[PDB]
Amino acid sequence: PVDQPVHNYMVKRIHKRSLSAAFAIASEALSLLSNTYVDGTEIDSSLRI
Amino acid sequence: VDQPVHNYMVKRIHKRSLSAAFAIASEALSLLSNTYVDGTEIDSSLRIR
Known part of the structure; x- marks a missing residue:
């Protein structure tokens, strides 16, 4: 029987x-x-260390 | 929630x-x-042994 050049979009x-x-x-x-x-002038050594 | 990452056991x-x-x-x-x-011949040889 019939059968076609068929397509599928979406x-x-x-x-x-x-x-x-x-x-x-x-x-x-x-x-x-x-x-x-x-x-904070003198001695925060280990603070920022 | 759980509670922070940052202890050092x-x-x-x-x-x-x-x-x-x-x-x-x-x-x-x-x-x-x-x-x-x-220094006196009965100390040096058996000294070695």
């Missing part, structure tokens, strides 16, 4: 699954982010 | 002993002393 649906990645600690930031080029 | 040390002797008799250290009393 219409759609697709998925996804919400994020981040980890660690979490305390208040260093400001806790000594108050300085930055005057105060 | 702590540990341990020994001490004590490990012993070993070598016992030299009394009879043994005077014919191990000189006073230059020796």
Whole structure:
């Protein structure tokens, strides 16, 4: 019987699954982010070490 | 949630002993002393042995 030069095109649906990645600690930031080029003159050696 | 990444667990040390002797008799250290009393034909050869 009948048989044709046939074709196949295409219409759609697709998925996804919400994020981040980890660690979490305390208040260093400001806790000594108050300085930055005057105060703290002498001896925080091992501090920045 | 669990709670942060960032500790560095702590540990341990020994001490004590490990012993070993070598016992030299009394009879043994005077014919191990000189006073230059020796040099005198009954100390040098059996000295070697």
